[PDB]
Amino acid sequence: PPGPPGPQGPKGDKGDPGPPGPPGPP
Amino acid sequence: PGPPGPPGPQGPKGDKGDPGPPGPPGPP
Amino acid sequence: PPGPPGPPGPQGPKGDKGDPGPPGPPGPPG
């Protein structure tokens, strides 16, 4: 009989860093 | 009974981060 | 003998959300 399911796969890559924030107020 | 199968697939890439904080108030 | 290797495991977790971006530029001189 074939054996049990394998282990959980690795975590995905971290998402890309976000963009610079907006300018401050004048 | 056979041994455990190979590892599962790598998970998907995370979501893009948020835009950063607003910059500092301008000076006079 | 022991049977053939079994099925693949579950999908790994999604990656963490990315870091926030850098601070925005200083506002214009008023």
Distance CA B19, CA C24 (A): 9
Cβ of C24 within 8 Å of Cβ of B20? The answer is: yes
Distance CA B4, CA B17 (A): 37
Cβ count within 10 A of residue B28: 4
C19, B18 in Cβ contact below 8 A? no
**Segments in chain C forming alpha helices (H):** none
Residues of A with CB under 8 A from a CB of B: 1-26
Which one-letter amino acid corresponds to residue A1? P
Distance CA C12, CA B6 (A): 13
Give the determination technique. Answer: X-ray
Cα-based distances in Å from C19 to A19, B20, B22, B28, C30: 10, 9, 15, 32, 31
Q: How distant is the Cα of A16 from the closest Cα of chain B, in angstroms?
A: 5
Q: For chain B, list the strands marked E by DSSP.
A: none
List CB contacts (< 8 A) between C25 and chain A.
20, 23-24
